Amino acid sequence: TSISDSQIIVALVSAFITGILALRLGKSLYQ
Amino acid sequence: DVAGLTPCKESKGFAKRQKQEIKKLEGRLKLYAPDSAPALAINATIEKTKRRFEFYGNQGLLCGTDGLPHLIVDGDQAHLGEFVYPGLVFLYIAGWIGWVGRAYLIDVRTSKKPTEKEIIIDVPLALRIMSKGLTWPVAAIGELRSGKLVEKSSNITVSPR
Amino acid sequence: MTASYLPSIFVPLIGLVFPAITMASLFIYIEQDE
Amino acid sequence: GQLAVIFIWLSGMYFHGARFSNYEAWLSDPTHIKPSAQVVWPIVGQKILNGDVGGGFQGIQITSGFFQLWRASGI
Amino acid sequence: AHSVKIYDTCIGCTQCVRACPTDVLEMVPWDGCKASQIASAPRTEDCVGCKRCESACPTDFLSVRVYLGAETTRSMGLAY
């Protein structure tokens, strides 16, 4: 069935964490 | 039959195309007087088409689905006249041309001013070179076996590695 | 769609604001003399 | 030399109007006959290009306006 | 700026010096040829990279070689 708002916010939080890790890896590649 | 192709003699599409082309030419003809030159031209067209289609039928060409002769180039003995025989004729002519050109280049590298001989062709020299192309394959094999056909790699300019 | 307002929110951001911040930051970065 | 070349070209146009053209038929009926002044040879099926331009003539339909120019000149 | 190099194959014809539009090359004493001179590039920082010196060298392959790079202000030929 259709996904709920709780699932939407869980996905958003997971994407935010993945973005934090991406920024960390980019800073690690920079120097 | 050699890839499901019927002979064009009993091909219904081939006859249909015959009929359509003749009918189109006759329709173009109806608008001209019988004695007029355009009428003669169109009638010559009709005769040309008829003889063309009869010739195509008489040589056992293979027509596919609808009427269109298809060429078999696998070496079949029943179709040697499509690619193998004209192919050999082409090979004889092309080898003639190339061989005589090569001979002319050879015969003008010993001249004092070869470039002038290339831009201004020595017509007598060129013609007596061209006459030698009749037996070009024999000369080619002789030069190949004697070693005068191929230059050794030690005398050919190459770029650094 | 579970949240119809959520496209109307996100598309403007990633379309106008994120490019604005990204290009401003990159312009400030590539014009540094150090 | 260029003037000589242009004269040859114009002489060719007038020759092709004299022989390989339906100029007089077009004079008789200019509204229903297509101008034509070039006729191909029947060699490789190119004879189809000799279209039915009208006036009991077959040839390439010309678009140079020479027919109208000669009509204006009184030819 | 760009890197300009001279090789021992030079014959001291001076044709590369005359073709230079920014006065980068000059002829110096030498003892490896009949002309008793060789080209040199003491002020390559003014070189623009036109390789006109390369086109003027008559040796089979060039005794003067320009390698480009850097692309500084003088190299880009900018008046602004």
Add this chain to the structure above:
Amino acid sequence: VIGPKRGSIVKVLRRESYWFNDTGKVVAVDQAPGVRYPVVVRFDKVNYAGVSTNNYSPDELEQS
């Protein structure tokens, strides 16, 4: 002497030469101690720049 005789036919061993593996005629050889490429070779065909002559050291020229 330094290198090949004047007028002799010599083959080029310089890999970077336009006339590698090609035959030319020696025009002059300089005997001055210090010259690195004293042998002057004339060629029948020009290079890309249009030059038909060059200078070689004797060690990169062989006798036919």
Add this chain to the structure above:
Amino acid sequence: MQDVKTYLSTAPVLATLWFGFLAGLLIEINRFFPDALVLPL
């Protein structure tokens, strides 16, 4: 006549003559032996 023959022996004039002769030969052959896809033998 030496100079005229030399000019006529130049590459473009000879090319024109030879290719015109070849074209005439092919055209006449097609006049008498037209619309053939198969070499009859």
Add this chain to the structure above:
Amino acid sequence: ASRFPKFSRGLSQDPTTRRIWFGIATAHDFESHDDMTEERLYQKIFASHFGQLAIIFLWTSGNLFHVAWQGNFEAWGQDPLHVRPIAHAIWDPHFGQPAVEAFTRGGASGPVNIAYSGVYQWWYTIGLRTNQDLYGGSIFLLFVSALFLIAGWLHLQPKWKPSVSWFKNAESRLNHHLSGLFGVSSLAWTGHLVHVAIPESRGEHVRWNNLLTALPHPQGLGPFFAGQWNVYAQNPDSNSHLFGTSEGAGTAILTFLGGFHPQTQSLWLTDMAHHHLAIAVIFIIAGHMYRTNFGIGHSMKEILEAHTPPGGRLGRGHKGLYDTINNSLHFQLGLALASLGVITSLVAQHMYSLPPYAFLAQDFTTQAALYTHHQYIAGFIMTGAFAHGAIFFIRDYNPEQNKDNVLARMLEHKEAIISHLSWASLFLGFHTLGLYVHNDVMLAFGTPEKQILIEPVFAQWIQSAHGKALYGFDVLLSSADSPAFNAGQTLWLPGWLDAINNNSNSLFLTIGPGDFLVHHAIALGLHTTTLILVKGALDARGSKLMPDKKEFGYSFPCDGPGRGGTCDISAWDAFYLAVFWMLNTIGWVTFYWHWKHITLWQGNVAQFNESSTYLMGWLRDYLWLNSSQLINGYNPFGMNSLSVWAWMFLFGHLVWATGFMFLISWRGYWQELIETLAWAHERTPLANLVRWKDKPVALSIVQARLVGLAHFSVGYIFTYAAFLIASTSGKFG
């Protein structure tokens, strides 16, 4: 002074806008960065690979999330042959009401895009049924990408950075990648197929909550460990089976039927499971070949040294190739891209004729898009492989260690290679173009019977050797008395022969003179692109015009107007020139595929068989005819759902022409114009107060070529994609 290109001192000191362009365009050339060590190079490459893996997994997770959130996956699954898949919702503030109501398809409540990637069919085949399954998959792949990002950050830390020698351990890497990455992954996938996909296609519902409860076969793992594996193929699915429904289903989990599923026109799930199991076994066996730590295996270097013919025809053979290949990352990249391009071409050529996903053959636009996608990807990958071979020769090839081995022998007789490629290209082009022009002239003169129509009898003989009975050659599975036919009649031939003798699918389509001409055009394209690329790769180190090309690098503009002119003398310029030819060749390939399949799907294949032999037929019956619905996407009388594809069609045309602009006018015109504009700005009041910091300069020569190439390629891709999708979806036929 440590400006934006912190990896290049020369660019940082450039006071022009060239600094920005070249810092953007030279970021990933790690070997060219200042103060670069091989250890740091390898570790940076490792972390970048981690980042790319994370990006790929994010991309697929986003696809999953959007299909779960804005799609009709459940409705499509309930009724696949009459439901259009939805890619994602559209929120464009610029739309009007007609655009809002034109793009409301697939039973959505607003404007949506109709997916043409085949993800619906693929996910339905592998057992995904509901939106919650897709959401769980998306969350899982988000976690996987986060894990790869964590790993990429971790291996860059001082106490977890690998060493150079670890990166050069070829034998251990091959063993692990063949056994685990290839073999164990395929074993896991066949386990999924046995446990989840097949039961799902047979009506059962197996999830994580009943994986240990659901029994894949009634006799579980008994006959497996008893050696009587035939029990797992005793009861195959019938031909009346409906996908996802228990009616007509069987109990076999590893069958060997071959052919297609009658109702989905796709490969059987059990056949694919057995496929993956077999290749997993083979790969796991193969991954035990090389010697790592246990005294058994092979030494790849010693294998290479041992393989030298005693006759000396190959010279020293493969001696010194191990060090040349292991020390040069560009050689490895070129080999990887060559293999990947070949395999991508294989994927494109095998998924249209052997559709692995249910209801994928019926989706014509999806099939066409997938084929064109993977073919263009393959072409680009091949160009990259050859470019990196050229870069290897320039930067990584040492003639000292590679002395008289196969590479040195290729360099020695490179003139012969290039001349024979030139001859092959010239012969193919001359004769194919001449035949096409002959056919054009014959149709023009009204005499189609005079065409030179050559029957592709060799490919038809191969088709007959594959079981095609249409041509009547009667050999090699087309004849009953052939030993191959007798051997195969028990296992796959009942399905394979039925599938190949069905002309309604794309399994070994019927071919004719047009197919002959177009395959020869394809051979021309491949040969000419290879000629350009190999010429660039083998003349990269030098030539008669530029004997010292290796010192100038890979991508340099020219060597000046001396020696007659030296434009496009670099190997990068060979790649630049070969990109046009690969684009042309893939365009021919996709044009053929698309037209053949339009006339196949509509049921009138006579149009292709009669019109593909001359180029006016290609222009009129394919390009002009199929673009009618495309160009009517929006008109003065309204607009429809194809308006976006018409707009993209025109957009691609425009980008193509802008690429023309960057490719024709070269540099000096723009530099003088920019000089004038700098004067104008400096002399204008109220605007000379605003000053630039980077002096504006015209684009460089190499940059101009690359920008023009990018515009050309983008226009090519967008124009053809718009035409393909619009003409295959406007008429679902």
Add this chain to the structure above:
Amino acid sequence: FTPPTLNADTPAPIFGGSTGGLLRKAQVEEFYVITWESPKEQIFEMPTGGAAIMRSGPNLLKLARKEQCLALGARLRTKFKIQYQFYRVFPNGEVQYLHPKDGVYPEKVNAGRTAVGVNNRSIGQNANPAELKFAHKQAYDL
């Protein structure tokens, strides 16, 4: 050879003005100044576009690039047979003598000149880039 100093009392040629001249670069980075001696009032062509009359005597002309200085000097030398010399002028008032570093034009070989950039080998005897991998130097720099 003692380099000459740049006099600030040297009249400029008769020129009516042009849009090709000194710009912001001349006032933020650098410009150039060419000086030459002429025997009579004659018309020459400005390297930036136009025509001017050179003074019957000392001349002083400001340019934006060194290439324009060389162009004007070459025309002066091969047309009017006039000796010339130019300087590089910085915004802080620093003047650098440029073209005849030793008073003799570079076309003529002069003693005391050092060989810079001269390689003691043939151009084709360069080291391969592969041997110099991961070393921050070029093949031609050896």
